Amino acid sequence: MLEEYRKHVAERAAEGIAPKPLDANQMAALVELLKNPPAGEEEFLLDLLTNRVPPGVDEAAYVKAGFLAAIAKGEAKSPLLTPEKAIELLGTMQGGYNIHPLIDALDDAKLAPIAAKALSHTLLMFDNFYDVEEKAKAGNEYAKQVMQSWADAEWFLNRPALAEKLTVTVFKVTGETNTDDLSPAPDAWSRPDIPLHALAMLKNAREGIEPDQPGVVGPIKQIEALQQKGFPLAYVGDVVGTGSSRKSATNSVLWFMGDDIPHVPNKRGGGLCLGGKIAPIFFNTMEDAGALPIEVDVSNLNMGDVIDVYPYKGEVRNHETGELLATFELKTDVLIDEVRAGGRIPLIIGRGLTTKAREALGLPHSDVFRQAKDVAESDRGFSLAQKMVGRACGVKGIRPGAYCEPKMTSVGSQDTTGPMTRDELKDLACLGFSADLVMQSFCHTAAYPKPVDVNTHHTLPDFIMNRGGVSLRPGDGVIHSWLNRMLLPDTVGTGGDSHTRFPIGISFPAGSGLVAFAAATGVMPLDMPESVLVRFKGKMQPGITLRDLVHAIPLYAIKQGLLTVEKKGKKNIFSGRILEIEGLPDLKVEQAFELTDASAERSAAGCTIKLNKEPIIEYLNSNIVLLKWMIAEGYGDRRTLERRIQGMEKWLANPELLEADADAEYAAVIDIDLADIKEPILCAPNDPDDARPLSAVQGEKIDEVFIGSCMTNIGHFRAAGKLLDAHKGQLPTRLWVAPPTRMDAAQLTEEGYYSVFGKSGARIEIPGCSLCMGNQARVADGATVVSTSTRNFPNRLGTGANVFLASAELAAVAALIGKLPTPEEYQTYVAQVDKTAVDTYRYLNFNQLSQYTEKADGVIFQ
Ligand SMILES: O=C([O-])/C=C(\CC(=O)[O-])C(=O)[O-]
């Protein structure tokens, strides 16, 4: 092990980074070395054992804990460690396989006092808390002091409180920092390897930042130079953390600006982040990771400024002058506790341990922790979302500003956050899921897998199914297209993807840390956000699509003055709030998804849309058959699938839907009149908020077109097909087509549409995210494209590419003529397909497809 291991150390040091943690195989070999240590290797072997092994239920941890338990029990011996030392080290693995040996040690007069100190600061006790109470009740004195210790919150009070004065050096990034900037798509493969992945942070050049190697390595040396001023760094920007939920963005920042975690290799916590505006998902990820995120005016903060931050006072001052630079308020006072605990998650878990111990010993109620603020007189009614969250909490409704913990009915996970989520789950010592349903897809890496992705394909499914989750297969297609067909109406959920925007019920997307917690405990912490109401009125004009309406939201918000495009001092009524939509209650559920999905680009924390029962009834009747069919096909964890089917059947039998009260409170109400939308609306190159009417950008030359995000359904493809079929010959553009699911692909194939795409010269990609994410295939450098995908951030679909977001029907026209069409032209082409609109926009209903029902009829409920 040793020789190969330090060759690795050297390879990595040459590149300036830490070595990867030991794996199970290496840990096993290490065990042998500890039993018979070669001369002169004592200190190395001890460091590897102590600092270079993942904690929790990682496979290497299993091996490490087993070895140590044996040492502590005399069952094994090493000249380098004593039983006392083994117990001490066991107390450093935070949870999982180290707890049993630690509890057993309480029955040993020698080790007990040490085991007790270790358990006293162990948070991940979960059900093991009872094992400890039982020993105390049987007369164990050391068990008693552990209980009292938990009861007194020693684990919390022994941690340094948040200082009153923080002196930090400003690392300032002007404009908007989205998570792609911090953690680029093409580098998604290295996310689980924190130190390596961090090298890509801000690798693309932008104002005031100097990448050590443009397009490959970020401003590591610029960062290092700033660290020499003697103060810790703070990340500072006008708009921070918009876009993708990838925790890797946070991991990277903290790797450079955070603090080490004792005995946990290659992962950092803490830190400070300041932005004019901070996207809600990013904010959560930062607080869960132990950082302190603060929304404040940053115009007076400059690259390299040394600064004094006073959390309790809410002031930022120049360090040399004492001048006031800005003032602020923490979003909640509980943040102070979160930082002290090392993050919101550890806080919740630890606080619950103390509470549990306080009730066992018959004590009052802790006064050590800050409580969430109280909400005033509960006179008025509730909005749809407030009722949904309320019901998930056993109450009629939850008010904005309140802290709550909704039950998680559905949890989604995809393959680019999956590996991180899996790691976070290991850190939380999770061996089984408590959420009602956890589904894992393989949509982001299936088309052009790297070797590491292949390992992901062969390993993540089991990790998920063994915990009771449902797993799809590479080639099945996009997460949301499947996940949405597994949802229960009016319920609450989350997912490791920013586009987890349930078209029925409500979801609050999150980073891998919180997704792990929600999967494991079946619950999610939530500071209830405010809502913004968007109301559609009237009838759609000719040739207008649902997608145009999605884009009209930012458009009208800009007209009314609730949204601005300029990044400095950006205004955005939607940021951090729940977007609630009404006015289109008869939309098919997948149509509803187009609107709810796009709430992500609004920077909304979540979304609801009011729908009638019929379209949901149709959807569920179709989904029941799909799920039975999945069982017949052999899919991941049958029991979970079966229970979900029953849940759907129960609802169909008594179809009830929640509804907003007429007197609900909203932060703002936006009315949009469909009669005023006469021409298609696009999102102009590189900003999802920059909505413009077709007439404003008509004539722009187009190189490449992309059709097929989770924003599309089979109807969009039929539409594009009919348009292409009408104008035979090869296209002047490069057209990419990517059906969201294999069910979609198969039906289009059966209907003859692949011949149509084939003759046109189009590329048909396998079911999955394809170009939408930009992590595998990419558009040509500097190309101008029109895309039905969700995000046109700089460098996403391609390097230096300019991307217009539009509807599928408009995109098909553009692909045909090589440029954005004029409103008149657009209407001429589409008029043609409207004649057969009934045939074109037929949705997939699995209960009407024999190949599906036949397999469903063959299933016996276990
Ligand atoms: O990178 C990821 O796997 C997270 C995503 C995908 C993306 O950025 O489209 C998200 O939260 O949306």
Ligand code: F3S
């Ligand atoms: S990345 Fe995939 S999940 Fe949807 S938003 Fe794009 S197709």
